[PDB]
From Swiss-Prot, chain A:
Protein species of origin: Severe acute respiratory syndrome coronavirus 2 (2019-nCoV)
Domain of life assignment: Viruses
From-to range in the entire protein, with total length: 983 to 1080 of 1273
Cystine connections: 50-61
Function: Subunit of the fusion protein that is processed upon entry into the host cell. Mediates fusion of the virion and cellular membranes by functioning as a class I viral fusion protein. Contains a viral fusion peptide that is unmasked after S2 cleavage. This cleavage can occur at the cell membrane by host TMPRSS2 or during endocytosis by host CSTL. In either case, this triggers an extensive and irreversible conformational change that leads to fusion of the viral envelope with the cellular cytoplasmic membrane, releasing viral genomic RNA into the host cell cytoplasm.
Protein name (record): Spike protein S2'
Residues carrying a glycan: 92
Amino acid sequence: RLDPPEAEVQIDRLITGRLQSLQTYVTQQLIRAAEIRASANLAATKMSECVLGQSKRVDFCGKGYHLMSFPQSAPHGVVFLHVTYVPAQEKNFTTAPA
Amino acid sequence: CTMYICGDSTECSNLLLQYGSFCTQLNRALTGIAVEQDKNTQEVFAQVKQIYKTPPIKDFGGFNFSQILPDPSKPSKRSFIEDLLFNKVTLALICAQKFNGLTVLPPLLTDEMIAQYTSALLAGTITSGWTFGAGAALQIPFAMQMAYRFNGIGVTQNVLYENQKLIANQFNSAIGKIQDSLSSTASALGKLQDVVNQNAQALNTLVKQLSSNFGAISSVLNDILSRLDPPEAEVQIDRLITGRLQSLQTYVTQQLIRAAEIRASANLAATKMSECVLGQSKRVDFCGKGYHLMSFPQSAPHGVVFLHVTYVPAQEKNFTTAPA
Amino acid sequence: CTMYICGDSTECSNLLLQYGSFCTQLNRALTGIAVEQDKNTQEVFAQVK
Amino acid sequence: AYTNSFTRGVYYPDKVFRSSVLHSTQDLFLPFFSNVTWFHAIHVTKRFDNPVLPFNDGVYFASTEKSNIIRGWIFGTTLDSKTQSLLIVNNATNVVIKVCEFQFCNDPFLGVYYSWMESEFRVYSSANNCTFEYVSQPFLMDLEGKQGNFKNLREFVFKNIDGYFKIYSKHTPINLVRDLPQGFSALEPLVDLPIGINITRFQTLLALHRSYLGAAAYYVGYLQPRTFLLKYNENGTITDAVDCALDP
Amino acid sequence: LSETKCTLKSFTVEKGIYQTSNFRVQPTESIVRFPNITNLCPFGEVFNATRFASVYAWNRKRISNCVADYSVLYNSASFSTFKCYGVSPTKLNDLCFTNVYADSFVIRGDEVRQIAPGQTGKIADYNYKLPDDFTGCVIAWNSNNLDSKVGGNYNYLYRLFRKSNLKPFERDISTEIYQAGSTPCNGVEGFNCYFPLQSYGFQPTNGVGYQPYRVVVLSFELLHAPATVCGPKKSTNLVKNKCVNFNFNGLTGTGVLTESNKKFLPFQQFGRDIADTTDAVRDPQTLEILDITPCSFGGVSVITPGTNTSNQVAVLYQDVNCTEVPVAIHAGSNVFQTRAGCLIGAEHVNNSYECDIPIGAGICASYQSQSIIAYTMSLGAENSVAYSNNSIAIPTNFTISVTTEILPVSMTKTSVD
Ligand SMILES: O=C(O)CCCCCC(=O)N1CCc2ccc([N+](=O)[O-])cc21
Ligand SMILES: *[C@@H]1O[C@H](CO)[C@@H](O)[C@H](O)[C@H]1NC(C)=O
Ligand SMILES: *[C@@H]1O[C@H](CO)[C@@H](O)[C@H](O)[C@H]1NC(C)=O
Ligand SMILES: *[C@@H]1O[C@H](CO)[C@@H](O)[C@H](O)[C@H]1NC(C)=O
Ligand SMILES: *[C@@H]1O[C@H](CO)[C@@H](O)[C@H](O)[C@H]1NC(C)=O
Ligand SMILES: *[C@@H]1O[C@H](CO)[C@@H](O)[C@H](O)[C@H]1NC(C)=O
């Protein structure tokens, strides 16, 4: 319905509007892709100390005293199974230093 | 959005719809930063499943903990030292912000419940040891509890058993100086106040940026509508709308960027509360300078504070050695 | 800001003010990335008294 | 013959109320710590200073006196009978403003003889073909009868934009001997006249007491484009300012 | 409740708490206030009169203290040109104007296109010039019957030669020989020496492009200072404490009016705050100062157990005291005042449970004749150790346990064109 001289004026607004919604998407993706990296670094550190050895750090590879662990795979992630030692059935006595 | 961009105008409100739902996404982004803040504080303090009680009779061998234990006389039941950290950080018009659609929400956990969580860890760290971290608490006299930690760094038991009074006096005199150190200078908590200064100095720029023309006749919607017909006013109201819709996105982007730096600090505090306060650490320079013995937590506004106890040698001498 | 956007023009310099102080914030953001860089190298090497 | 003004010369740039806020503006202001000239009129060698001076973009005028010896000004381009000029006078009975084609004298002045009375008025010789006039209501003003140190100060600002003449003014009582005091004070709008002529010069006219060739002096300074920062009280007055380009 | 389904664009909602919108109040009536004045402006002395001036020496007249009703010109006057800059013709009946002026002169027929900013010609270069930021209107009409005669009319002149160009709203009424060459004129006309002023010759039989015209220019300023000329509108009384619309010398808005303590100067009429908004004004019929404040502020939230269970909800007001609540959409006697606002539609209780829906400030709500309740969240159990100086406890058995942990690793890849 309009000649080029009039169509350009109203096509520039559309172009500048549509070029703005393609940048928020990229910015948000860039921001949100920096947390999966932190999670994947923790997973890599946890696969070398609880699966390839025994850990003395408290509450790192489970609740209790660490014995061993096994890995498994899930879609877009990983799963761990931890084995621990837990006491029970305490009793009272009398004590002396020497 | 509508109360900040347009105001009470109905022509501006009707014209806004053409741009579409552009800030329901802004609100979606802003609402995800509050649940995270609520979850941050529940991984540092809520680590004990049971609320223990401080024993009434004090028989600890010569150690005095009376300055880091709850005081019933003081309201809110806060320890003496905790009350000095609450007078050194200050939370410094709000009516102008409220008239433009800006508000502040309260946290879920009150400051009185946070002090009930740090008074159970302290009570369970003195009567059981590290046995309450995994399982059920098992009692042990304190003097025999310190021998374990001495054996854990290489020294023997008779060294501790033969110098009890001196060690107790040293601990008392060392912990009696923190009070006077903190009762003089208020600049010690310099990093807990920067977060307050920010997030508060950045909410006034939003209000100040409402008095700028973006290529229009003026910056008041009641002076463009009092002299021009709708066909002409629609041309010059779009410039203001697009200008004011741009300063609401930089704020959200910067808040999103800067809220990802507190999560790392919260994770570090959560990791440091499970290894220095619920056990003994062999990692060098993790829970202080020297050889680690034990540690105690405390609470401050928007943060946490730790106190570390270490062992340091002195008075060396020279000898002669041989491999065999 | 003024040397990159306008140049030596005085008409552009006078017209810029209408948009307000929009890049003092840019400079505030840029100046906080240099103190951090200076502090980064002092926590790795300066560990011996 | 040379003095500097530290922080003097400031006028309200708009007509709107404001309180407890800092504001920034760009206008034609008199810079800080700038050179200024001194003109004398003292009879012990007698002196009588009324030279013709330029009018570049504006003018800041100040006079300290005990007995009224400064009356008005005359503005123009060639100060002859070939162009239009402007006249502001005080003939001791009322204020007169006229825009005609005058033929001014070489040494304009007024005078008194006795007690004291107004007798002589020698400014122009003829006026023709002019289209602006205004006369204020009559008043009686004292003459002479004083001697000692200076007591009064008066300041003025002149501008010429789009055929408009604007004047700001303010008066302050002071006690001093041989200088201009220091302080802060803002000037307020006075009047706006339509004339529509090209002005590139000006001059001052005085009075003499039945004498030839008592104590008074005046200053002169020009204007330049500048940007300032102003501060307001809780009441609504300006009390301090800063120049944004004086030094780093 | 129905304001959230539209917000999230669906017919089903789930458990949680949502924000919706703020609280709004609407105006009740209107109001107008204008200065009171009776005299009518001089519409006759200005437009149609005896004789007009020449272009090179025009005229200027001042108008003040009158009421502008231009409908009185419909009977006789017929204008062929009318243009206004900086304002809209349909809005001229509701405003008040300040510093008005009028100019008048006579020019030729096809030289009326040069009366406009940014133009070139012999009339816009030596006789009459207009500024760039103009505010006013231009009017012209044909006057061939009143300024022409047989033998011509030679009483209208215009300047033909000059050294430079004029400046806006400037005048020049000087006559002096003009030297167009290298020989000084010496005051006597001759070769390369001309008289700068010429004459217009008007005859009744000339073409349509050689006939006299009359021009008038109007100039004023708007909405910046006290005014003395106002249009044909009516006044009203003063209602103070309630949300109403107002018209103060052309300014429009809504809010609440109250008595203030500020003290304006003689040459001031409006006030401003940190942002460019108006919050003070002077009544033009009483000489007093008033204040203006908005009418809406305060947030809300909705608590629901899910649309698949029931249709009941509760509403939380975050800036009210339930003791005396003046703002409430509907406001069943189930009013409970927490530390985070005011709650309507929920039942208080005494015992404690584990939090289900976090309201805030140490309170929670859950759905449980079913209804909604609001308890206080509990911290946990309670215990007490037996600390003695010669006692100890030792285990005698053990247990084996297994637990799990989940961690995301990667993401999805994408591309755009
Ligand atoms: O062509 C028409 O249909 C009528 C146009 C005339 C519009 C006059 C007008 O808009 N104003 C605004 C303020 C004012 C003061 C004095 C006079 N005056 O000349 O008396 C006129 C006006
Ligand atoms: C400026 O003032 C100083 C101060 O006495 C004077 O020496 C100097 O001559 C003045 N400037 C000029 C151009 O004379
Ligand atoms: C035109 O001028 C005559 C002169 O008296 C006057 O009678 C007449 O009313 C004027 N025109 C109008 C429309 O009033
Ligand atoms: C008209 O305005 C004047 C100006 O203050 C005022 O004194 C007078 O009362 C007003 N007239 C009426 C009827 O109120
Ligand atoms: C919805 O309500 C129905 C009726 O009790 C129930 O059977 C169903 O499990 C609920 N949930 C869904 C997803 O339908
Ligand atoms: C719950 O507490 C209120 C307030 O003290 C009390 O009046 C009420 O009796 C309590 N409910 C029961 C069942 O005791």
